[PDB]
Amino acid sequence: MELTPDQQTLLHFIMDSYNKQRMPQEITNKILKEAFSAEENFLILTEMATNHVQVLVEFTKKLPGFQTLDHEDQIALLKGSAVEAMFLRSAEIFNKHSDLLEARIRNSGISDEYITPMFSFYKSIGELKMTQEEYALLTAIVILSPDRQYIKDREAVEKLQEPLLDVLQKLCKIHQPENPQHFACLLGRLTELRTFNHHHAEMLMSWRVHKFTPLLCEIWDV
């Protein structure tokens, strides 16, 4: 049981692109040094989200075949995956300063209705003991979801997503042969990720008392 050379090449492009992602030192120092209040904590979350959307665009452009998709479908895929990819990355960083970041999130004026399933998701991500290949492929599968709103050529997106699901399943058989439910538990995280779209939309609606950044206003139609 091994990946074919073609699957190894596809996996290598995903990993290389995933490994490039960085949170700039200017933003990380703010987590340590800025004032502790609901207003300042919310502003830090906003800045981190903006940096992550930028990181998400750069990662997506290096995904094999993404730049061959219809230009407007590229926009529609980025807009529909931004929250899901941001939660998956948050889950990864939380499961590897961390005490102060958690404190800021819990004291950013965001309701427990949102915070509770969020920390519950980070917990279930941790129990999976995900490898970096699993984090990167799940991120790409989330981005390349053919069922997002306003996609014109869905079949073209299906052609890019299916081989990634084939690679992820093969890795599950190679690395966890005694746990045949491993792939199923990863799919469980895909469906759980989708629930954060409704929760995030309710947070943006109720926050009408606020400015965000132009990048966040664009992707979330604020």
Binding site: Q54, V57, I75, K79, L215, E218, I219
Partner: peptide
């Protein structure tokens, strides 16, 4: 003209 900054980030080399 919609998603001006998102298009800028996507379209730059």
């Amino acid at each position: 003209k919609d998603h001006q900054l998102l298009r800028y980030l996507l379209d730059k080399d």
